[PDB]
Amino acid sequence: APVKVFGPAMSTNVARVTLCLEEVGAEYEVVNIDFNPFGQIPAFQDGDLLLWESRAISKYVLRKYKTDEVDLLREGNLKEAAMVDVWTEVDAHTYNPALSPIVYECLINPLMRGLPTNQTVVDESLEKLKKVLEVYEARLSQHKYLAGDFVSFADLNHFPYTFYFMATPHAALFDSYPHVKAWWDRLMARPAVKKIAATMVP
Amino acid sequence: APVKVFGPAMSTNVARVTLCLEEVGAEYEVVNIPFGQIPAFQDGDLLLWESRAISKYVLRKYKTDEVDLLREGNLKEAAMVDVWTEVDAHTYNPALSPIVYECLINPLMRGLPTNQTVVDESLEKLKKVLEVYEARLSQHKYLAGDFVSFADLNHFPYTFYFMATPHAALFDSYPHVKAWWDRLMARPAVKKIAATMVP
């Protein structure tokens, strides 16, 4: 019984769910656009369970399909799970609020509506993001991935908005942070990530 | 062996961690390093940051059949805990916290005038959030089901400071939300932490 994801595949929050589903090898069906295509929250159905909110859906998927091969939350190991949780929360409350206004001002608003970019909002965000990337640079100088030497929910959570940031004029900023840039290219080589990236087209 | 929390007891995010420690009956120290400062935490050689990550580590480590606040052995119950934890983080708290800043934090710590127009932008926005809470808590005593969980405890710190602003009586128009808030305030762990967010 394939689970159902409701929403536009190019939404950052729908792509978070489908990336998790691809990383665990689950079969699923994506059901149509809306009723913003870049931000809309997914609904989800697995049998009689109906869920909302992409982070809760994603964690349900990573638990239900966990194997010894594929354990992206590490819940049996409290130290590892704690590090997954830490960098999941850094994404949600620190990295994404610094990066997503750049994506909206430079990519989404011009692309969807021909709206002008507000360079003052973008510039505030860039200075905030630069301080954040200094922290990621030190972390990813110690480990291949954010939670340790294994890929996890923490890394996957960074994919959808960062992918769109890479289509703005500021993508070159990551080159000032070579270990962050190395980590980004590691993620972009994963076959599940390439699969979802091909779905994220306007 | 006791664990250490780093940060001010007053902080909304330190209180999330200390409430979790009190509900599991854990032995801990608090070491004072505005109302939103992110805590650090030490257990042996494990050093953590971010109150929700620390809180979950605590609720897993000290878990018992009496105190299972994450519900991780039942994927469907854990899903509902996660849903309402996210609603708190990205919907309820962004509605509620600017009322705390512009009625309580900024007029009594930063010396700013109480911007009584972003207060009404937040109030009208909080009103439509509470409608959804009122429907949810009308067929469950708690957010994740008929059991208290991390989802409910997550709402305590900011709601405790909202309850100290002029607009505390807004909950009275949502009787199932009010009755839910009353069940949380009656817990001994909650009463004990509430006493720390004041001196």
Residue numbers in the entry:
A (entry chain B): 2 to 36, 50 to 216
B (entry chain A): 2 to 34, 51 to 216
What did the publication describing this PDB structure actually write?
The structures of sh101 and sh155 enzyme variants were resolved at 1.87 and 2.00 Å resolution and compared to the wild-type AmGSTF enzyme structure that has been recently reported. Sh101 and sh155 were crystallized with two and three molecules in the asymmetric unit, respectively. The sequence between the β2 and β3 strands where the α2 helix is located exhibits significant distortion due to high flexibility. This part has not been modelled in sh101 because of the high flexibility and lack of electron density. Amino acid sequence alignments of the sh101 with the parent enzyme AmGSTF showed 94.98% identity. For instance, the region Tyr118-Arg127 has three substitutions in sh101 sequence (Gln119Glu, Phe122Ile, Met125Leu), as a result of the replacement of the C-terminal part of the α4 helix by the sequence derived from the crop-type GSTFs (TdGSTF and HvGSTF). Among the selected enzymes, sh101 and sh155 exhibited the highest improvement in kcat values (185.9 ± 1.8 min−1 and 197.7 ± 3.2 min−1, respectively), corresponding to an approximately 5-fold improvement, compared to the wild-type AmGSTF enzyme (35.9 ± 1.7 min−1). Furthermore, the sh101 enzyme exhibited lower S0.5 and Km values towards CDNB, leading to significant improvement (7–8 times) in catalytic efficiency compared to the parent enzyme AmGSTF. In particular, the Tm values of sh101 and sh155 enzyme variants were significantly increased by 8.3 and 5.2 °C compared to the parent enzyme AmGSTF. Inspection of the crystal structures of sh101 and sh155 shows that Lys93 can form a new salt bridge with Asp62 of the opposite subunit.
GSTs are a multifunctional superfamily of enzymes, distributed in all major kingdoms of living organisms. They are long established to catalyze the conjugation of the tripeptide glutathione with diverse electrophilic and hydrophobic compounds, resulting in their modification to display higher solubility and less toxicity. GSTs that belong to the phi class are dimeric enzymes, comprised of two identical subunits. Residues of the N-terminal domain residues assist the formation of a GSH binding site (G-site), whereas hydrophobic residues of the C-terminal domain form the hydrophobic substrate binding site (H-site).
